[PDB]
Write a protein that binds this ligand. Structure first.
Ligand SMILES: CC(=O)N[C@H]1[C@@H](OP(=O)(O)OP(=O)(O)OC[C@H]2O[C@@H](n3ccc(=O)[nH]c3=O)[C@H](O)[C@@H]2O)O[C@H](CO)[C@@H](O)[C@@H]1O
Ligand SMILES: CC(=O)N[C@H]1[C@@H](OP(=O)(O)OP(=O)(O)OC[C@H]2O[C@@H](n3ccc(=O)[nH]c3=O)[C@H](O)[C@@H]2O)O[C@H](CO)[C@@H](O)[C@@H]1O
Ligand SMILES: O=C[C@H](O)[C@@H](O)[C@H](O)[C@H](O)COP(=O)(O)O
Ligand SMILES: O=C[C@H](O)[C@@H](O)[C@H](O)[C@H](O)COP(=O)(O)O
Ligand SMILES: N[C@@H](CCC(=O)O)C(=O)O
Ligand SMILES: [Mg+2]
Ligand SMILES: [Mg+2]
Lengths: 652, 653
């Protein structure tokens, strides 16, 4: 679910320049949802733009944004030549987790057949049923099955029952949000208020970009209960409502990050907040594929760089020092606690499984790793002396965020491992670490996993920096981190060999990925990737659990991938490999280069370079990232837009 | 794999009766799986015994015990009518390890071409290579590739180099086991020690059954290190001994058994049983509650079917004497002397493998609710790999039907080394995990003969719930919750019968999935364990790719598998996760999924919007897992039957 609108005040833009800016913004947000899309702009074909703000046009269509960009064009009624000196256009791409992704269920919604109020909504209204009944009794007919329509039919109810003839648009929206429950990020547009936009939020992101060749009046809009942000001397200004910074960085790097219950409004081209204007620390290059055919491919092959950015200014190899600035004012108190709890979903949960063993080694504390959804279902006991970690690339996952607030209520020290500054999880955690992996566009997490991995390793290195007995072990790990980027490059150089393997598996229905110890997480994450983008039925199986049932599923026809690395479980893994073979299995073994024994007795082997036992998981998962990528291409699927879902689960 | 020996001392038995007893003992051990079998007994057709105590005869063969019995009666020269006042017969079923299924590689293994010594073995001699090379250098020729044969040749070497002409049979075996490495359960017989038996074990179970119409000298055999010291009939000599690697082969003759422990050397000399060690303590003669009827299929065509459909009975057996529905009290006898110390611990760790681990997942939430302590559930193999931190105030539970699973046992010893309180949840009296735990509960589900865990899972479930009810018996705020749970247990056996009465509905579902290669089983909360266990059963029994998926994880990736062709089974019960499960259902249907829903009998909302629905009755939320897993037990059973599979035949090792 993404939001984008374009308000050009006294900046002449033709109807083709605004429609091509609305679509260009949705593409920046398409990875957050691509089941449907829509736009809402001014209609009418009058040369004088002032005689057209009373007619609203909605173009919504099923499919990605490319299905909408083609529905906007080749229209016989919309003349794409009218010059608009003041105009407001709202757009929205939708992740349809329920119901059909039909044009009626897409946004912007409408309050009536004449489109007096259209709204784009991100989130859920937890009481849209009671609001739908109240509105149906007063004489409002509903058309869609979404919860967003109860916001459009309600802003018109506050307008049809206003006390004065000139009630500000803010007042109409302020009365609506007072009847809306749950979370929402809204951007309204009405014919009665031509050119005026209103942007309120509550538990959902929403920022306002600004671009103007003229000086701005202030650099800190004062909240209300010498006041508005507007260009000095002249009126030319361009605003960019958006639920993300990627859709705004392309045009400007001056945004206003609203807060919960802040009702922003642009009236006569002046932005006022009812109830900061900072620069963005992002470059446009960070959200571009570059020379890669897909964001996922880029983000996999850039892992040597993102790993380095994660350690930048934090790891000093000349003296073997680890300093995480985000934990400077808390590391001492974290060490007085008695238990570590890692809470996350999906791939972020796998990062905790991947580092659980080393955290237990270097901190000597119990480490519990919990899936957020199940953590909440069970009402897990949490205590004042627990340290609870929350791994979230987006920093907005609903279940992970609920676990955070759950633990905070019980007095635990909360730590965030996030990749999005200013995100809910990052803000509401007591402390934490920004993994500095850069924007992740592909739906499937690749560099986020390995960067979370490295981040939790550095934390462990801090927790034992005062133990004489562990000094040697710390050097081993840190030397491994120094060599890790180049070893990742060595793994990426086997891309062709991985692609060849994919041609031998793309036709199969299932594949079992097996590992243990440090590589339990590897086979779980690999099985998840193959599920998500190739749609093969891949399942991770703890190697030690084969003999207890799952081994019965193995025969000469069942594809099997095993991970056998040079650590303390090598012998146990060799035993599991012998089991798979005795059952007639013909497995592909991800093993170490020097592992001559395995390489000789196995036809298909992916030989990764050696590393420290607690870092090898980073090198063993990358082949599975690549394998899923190639399998998806062979089966004819888009690796950046897998089916049935999108990126970041910000609604439960 | 299977060991059985029968020693009649001054209990006259004919050679026919002896051989029938040996064969009958192996039939109780066939369910373990085997490829070869054989027997060893006194040869010679001279009227009156004793003169026949120098001609040990062997009859071994490759195949089933049936073929062995047929062979036993195909011996022309053999006279089956000779009466024996004293006689020892040993017998064995083999699971080939070091050698191919063959007659020569079958047990018993002999020490020479005249059968001066014979031995039956369960286990592996790791250092048999060095031993074989040594014996050959001393002039001992081998005839088989078995590691067992080294045991037979070595005991004769010790005999050929004995210091005195009257060194005991025990002393010889003591010297043999000092050279063996690995695991072994052994029974020895020799012409030089007629009528005597020596049994010893290390890392493999071995028990002795005893029967006599006369008073026995004791019920606690004292250990003798290197007469009130041994077991025997007091006023008369008549007695019968039964060595066995599993009580199923003894219970029909006697329920008085002695469980041997590692490095024990049990010897029967002049009809008297003593136990020696090299290192007061003693071994107890105890009474098993087991009955022959419990290891028979009865009218069921398979043990899997029996143990699924008898779960109303086994659940009652788990609760018998432990629950009182009048005053709402739970008393687990095995925890009387430890419950108060457990309540002073600060964390629960459940450690297990496979379905036993699922039992922990299935009861984690209620344990957290009623104990209010953190509850960690760990897979034993991974628990060991990570060197999981364990502390003195941890209470560690070990769930194991057999009580012998290697990784669960090693986890038990891991936690004992760190001073943790260890608690066993087991279904095998005398098992390693049952003995070595400080305390525990025998779930009393009866022997599990089927390949897959069916009643053991549900009996472990009920047992852990009963323990949770003990932990909170002093909390006023929880009295009502305890009553709700206990009235649910009261109703539980009848609710199971209700679920089993839907068997016809499960077969229709088995038909729908007959040709399918995958199936996703989705649930959350109390039914996360249900999905995992159902997915394992269908993997183990049906050999199709069934996978359990936590419903709350669908939107994080796995939902990409849903389409119009992927079979899906969703579990939607009426507990606090109901709305979230409905959410997951809408997510699946939106992506062209057409799932079969296991739901509550009176969930009219979902029954009407879903084509096929398995409608189980309602129970307390923390018990529904027992009712919702049974349809998945039956689904796995019927699918395998439709595909021609033998549900009592293990496909893996
Ligand atoms: C956002 C920011 O300006 N970071 C600066 C900080 O990085 P530095 O690495 O020192 O700290 P982080 O960027 O990781 O986190 C910034 C602050 O947000 C908090 N936090 C972070 C993540 C989370 O999930 N929860 C949470 O509470 C941290 O505790 C910390 O107080 O010093 C560096 C200089 O050495 C600068 O290069 C970085 O620009
Ligand atoms: C084995 C035995 O004779 N149990 C008797 C016991 O049952 P009862 O129910 O009282 O106790 P259990 O059978 O569960 O366990 C027996 C003993 O073994 C210990 N133990 C058991 C399982 C385990 O995994 N770890 C462990 O240490 C128990 O702590 C206990 O000391 O009294 C009942 C009479 O009321 C009898 O019907 C049972 O025959
Ligand atoms: O490849 C799968 C995705 O990366 C997915 O598993 C993701 O990790 C979660 O849906 C939310 O995780 P975040 O909170 O870290 O975004
Ligand atoms: O159907 C599952 C199998 O029965 C198996 O998974 C079982 O649960 C354990 O692997 C055996 O160990 P225990 O005997 O200790 O339960
Ligand atoms: N290791 C012995 C005995 C195996 C067993 O049946 O336990 C063999 O292979 O002959
Ligand atoms: Mg913070
Ligand atoms: Mg005990």
């Amino acid at each position: 679910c993404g939001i984008f609108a374009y308000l050009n005040y006294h900046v002449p833009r033709t109807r083709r320049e605004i429609l091509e800016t609305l679509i260009k913004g949705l593409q920046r947000l398409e990875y957050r949802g691509y089941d449907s899309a829509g736009v809402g702009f001014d209609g009418g074909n009058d040369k004088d733009w002032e005689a057209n703000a009373c007619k609203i046009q909605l173009i919504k269509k099923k499919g990605k944004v490319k299905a909408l960009d083609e529905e906007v064009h080749k229209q016989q009624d919309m003349d794409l030549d009218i010059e608009f000196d003041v105009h407001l256009g709202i757009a929205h791409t939708r992740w349809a987790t329920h119901g059909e992704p039909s044009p009626v269920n897409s946004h912007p919604q409408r309050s009536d057949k004449n489109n007096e109020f259209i709204v784009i909504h991100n989130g859920i209204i937890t009481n849209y049923k009671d609001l739908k009944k109240f509105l149906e009794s007063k004489g409002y007919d509903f058309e869609s099955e979404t919860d967003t329509e109860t916001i459009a039919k309600l802003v018109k109810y506050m307008y049809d029952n206003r006390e004065s003839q000139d009630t500000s648009f803010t007042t109409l929206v302020e009365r609506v949000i007072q009847q809306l429950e749950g979370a929402f990020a809204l951007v309204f547009k009405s014919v009665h208020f031509p050119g005026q936009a209103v942007g309120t939020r509550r538990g959902s992101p929403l920022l306002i970009g600004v671009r103007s060749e003229h000086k701005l009046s202030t650099d800190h809009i004062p909240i209300l209960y010498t006041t508005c942000l507007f260009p000095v001397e002249e009126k030319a200004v361009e605003y960019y409502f958006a639920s993300d910074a990627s859709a705004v960085i392309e045009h400007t790097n001056r945004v206003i990050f609203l807060e919960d219950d802040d009702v922003a409004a642009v009236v006569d081209g002046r932005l006022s907040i009812h109830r900061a204007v900072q620069t963005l620390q992002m470059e446009l290059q960070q959200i571009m594929k570059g020379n890669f055919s897909s964001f996922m491919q880029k983000e996999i092959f850039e892992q040597p760089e993102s790993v380095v950015n994660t350690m930048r200014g934090r790891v000093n190899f000349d003296d073997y020092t680890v300093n995480l600035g985000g934990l400077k004012d808390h590391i001492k108190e974290i060490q007085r606690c008695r238990r570590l709890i890692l809470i996350a979903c999906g791939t972020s949960y796998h990062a905790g499984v991947a580092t659980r063993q080393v955290l237990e080694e270097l901190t000597e504390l119990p480490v519990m790793v919990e899936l957020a959804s199940d953590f909440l279902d069970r009402n897990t006991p949490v205590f004042r002396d627990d340290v609870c970690f929350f791994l979230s690339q987006s920093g907005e996952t609903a279940d992970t965020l609920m676990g955070l607030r759950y633990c905070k209520e019980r007095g635990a020290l909360t730590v965030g491992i996030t990749n999005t500054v200013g995100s809910s999880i990052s803000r509401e955690t007591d402390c934490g670490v920004h993994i500095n992996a850069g924007p992740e566009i592909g739906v499937a997490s690749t560099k986020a996993y390995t960067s979370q991995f490295v981040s939790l390793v550095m934390f462990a290195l801090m927790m034992c920096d005062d133990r004489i007995s562990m000094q040697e072990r710390r050097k081993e790990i840190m030397l491994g981190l120094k060599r890790l980027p180049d070893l990742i490059k060595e793994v990426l150089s086997m891309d062709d060999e991985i692609q060849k393997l994919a041609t031998e598996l793309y036709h199969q229905k299932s594949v079992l990925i097996m590992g243990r110890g440090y590589h339990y997480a590897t086979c779980l994450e690999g099985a998840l990737k193959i599920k998500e983008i190739t749609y093969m039925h891949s399942e991770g199986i703890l190697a030690g659990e084969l003999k207890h049932g799952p081994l019965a599923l193995v025969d000469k026809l069942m594809p099997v991938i095993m991970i056998i690395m040079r650590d303390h479980t090598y012998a146990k893994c060799q035993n599991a490999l012998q089991q798979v073979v005795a059952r007639q299995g013909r497995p592909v073994v991800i093993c170490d280069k020097e592992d001559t024994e395995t390489i000789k007795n196995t036809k298909r082997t992916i030989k990764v370079p050696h590393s420290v036992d607690c870092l090898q998981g980073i090198l063993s998962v990358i082949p599975l990232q690549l394998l899923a990528f190639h399998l998806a291409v062979l089966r004819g699927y888009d690796v950046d837009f897998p089916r049935n879902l999108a990126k970041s689960v910000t609604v439960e």
